[PDB]
Structure formats: C-alpha cells, structure tokens
C-alpha cells in the first residue's frame, strides 16, 4: 500500500441508515448480491495468487544517489566535474517536478473529497500549492528547451542581485 503521511486523508464519518418508510431499498439487496456473486470468487482467486506469490519471493530496491559537488564548486570548461554536476541537477529537476505533481494531486483530492465546501475546507492545500508553485517558478522557469545548470545559476544570481539592489533602495 501507500504511505498516508505523504498522501493525507481525513478519517471518514459515515452516517447510520435510519429509514422512515417500509419499502425495502434495492441498494442493500444488490450490495448483498455483490459480496455474494462477485467479491467471494475474486477474493478466492486473489488468495490463490497470493499463495503462489508467497511460494517464490524476491526483492527489489530503490536506487540511492550520493551527493556530488554542484556547479558552484566546478571549474569552468572542466567537463569532468561539470558533467556530474549537470547530471545531479537534472535528477533534482525531475524530482522537483514529481514533488509539484504530488502537491497538485493533493489539491485535486481535497477539492473532490470536500465537494460543495471546497473553497473553505481546502485552505491549507491551496496555500501549500501556492508555495510550491512559487518556489518552482522562481527556480526553474524561463530557461528554455536547452536548459542547463549554468542557466539556472545565472537566473538565481540575477534574482539575488535584484533582491539585494531592491533592499539597498529601501534601506
């Protein structure tokens, strides 16, 4: 299964069925027929498949990457270190793209789960989405199709220069 801390969900609160009439609803009868004719053979087949899988067990692992020095401590026109720095930067870039994807999935899940009170009950998810979108836009936007670590470093240097200059104007 998945991890509930990365993908949060509130505990559900299901009301009890308290009917006010005498006509039997077909939903309960159809549900009982559903666990009779459908759920039992499906669960039996899954139990057999799980037994066959428990007969032969093997594992796989999540690949771990150690930290290589980045482009800020790389000599210019020294491809041996810049290649590793650029590979690390591209791996980080893909990881951040999936992080923003996770936050978008959280926001959509919150909206669908809350339904008609989504614009009040999903303030925290919207704030998290705004924060991660702002940081992604300040980190990776307007680079082009030929993006590299040097362009990102130049953009960050220009942003810090602008921030320092704007601080100096208002000091």
């Amino acid at each position: 299964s998945w991890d509930k801390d990365v993908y949060p969900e509130p505990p559900r609160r299901t009301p009890a069925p308290s009917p006010q009439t005498s006509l039997p609803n077909p939903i309960t009868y159809l549900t009982k027929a559903f666990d009779l004719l459908v759920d039992r053979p499906v669960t039996l087949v899954r139990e057999f498949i799980e037994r066959q899988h428990a007969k032969n067990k093997y594992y796989y692992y999540h690949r771990e990457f150690r930290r290589v020095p980045d482009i800020t401590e790389c000599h210019e026109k020294d491809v041996l270190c810049m290649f590793e720095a650029e590979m690390q930067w591209k791996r980080d870039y893909k990881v951040d793209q999936e992080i923003v994807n996770i936050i978008q999935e959280r926001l959509k899940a919150c909206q669908q789960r809350e339904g008609e009170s989504h614009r009040q009950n999903c303030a925290k998810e919207l704030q998290q989405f705004t924060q991660v979108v702002k940081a992604y836009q300040d980190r990776y936007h307007d680079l082009g199709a030929h993006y590299s670590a040097r362009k990102c470093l130049a953009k960050q240097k220009q942003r810090m220069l602008a921030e320092r200059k704007a601080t100096k104007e208002a000091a």
Binding site: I71, C74, D78, G144, A154, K157
Partner: protein, 120 residues
C-alpha cells in the same frame, strides 16, 4: 609548414626516428579498408573487360589486395611518423617559450558572472 624540419635529411621516406614509434598492426581498420579498396579495384578490372566478376582471375585479385595492403602499410607508417613529429615540435616549442603560454587562473562558477537571457 614542416619544410625546414625535413631540410637536413632530404628525400627520406621513413627516417631513423620513425623506428622509435610503434608500427601499425596488421589488423588495422585502415589497412583492412585499403585491402577492401584493392579487392574492389580487382572486381572493377574483371567487370570492365566482360569477365565473371566474382569468378575469373583469382590470382589477379589476390595480387591487387596484396599490393594495396603493402603500399597502404608503408603510407600509414609514414603518416603516424609525421603526426608524431608534429606533436613533438609543438610540445618542444611550448616548453622552450614559457612566457608566451601563461597558465590561466581557472575560476569556479561561484565567482564568475554569466548574463541570464530568459526564454518566454
């Protein structure tokens, strides 16, 4: 460019210093290509005289291949000799004149400044 280098030992195909270099291997890709050229020339010789191309004149094709491989081996040996001479002269001239080739201060990217041109 190298006219003054081979001016004290003239008309030498392969000088004594060429014996200090490793000779090309007999399984060299360039030697195989030159042998393939010789075989193609043998096939053309068969073709333009109205002969069976893959059948007639096996001894002639073998002589074509052998002569091409011989000439190509000697030419390759001369080529590697002259490239080695070029490299030796280049390194000697760099070593003899240190003031014309100063070592550059190789800065990292935390000190250098590159202008950012946004694409949008």
């Amino acid at each position: 460019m190298m006219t003054g280098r081979q001016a004290r030992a003239p008309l030498q195909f392969l000088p004594d210093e060429a014996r200090s270099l490793p000779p090309p291997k007999l399984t060299d890709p360039r030697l195989a290509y030159i042998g393939f050229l010789g075989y193609c020339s043998g096939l053309i010789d068969n073709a333009i005289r109205r002969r069976p191309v893959l059948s007639a004149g096996l001894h002639r094709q073998f002589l074509y291949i052998t002569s091409f491989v011989f000439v190509g081996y000697y030419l390759l040996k001369r080529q590697d000799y002259m490239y080695a001479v070029r490299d030796h002269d280049m390194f000697s001239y760099i070593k003899s004149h240190p003031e014309d080739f100063p070592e550059k201060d190789k800065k990292t990217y935390r000190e250098v400044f590159e202008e950012f041109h946004p694409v949008r």
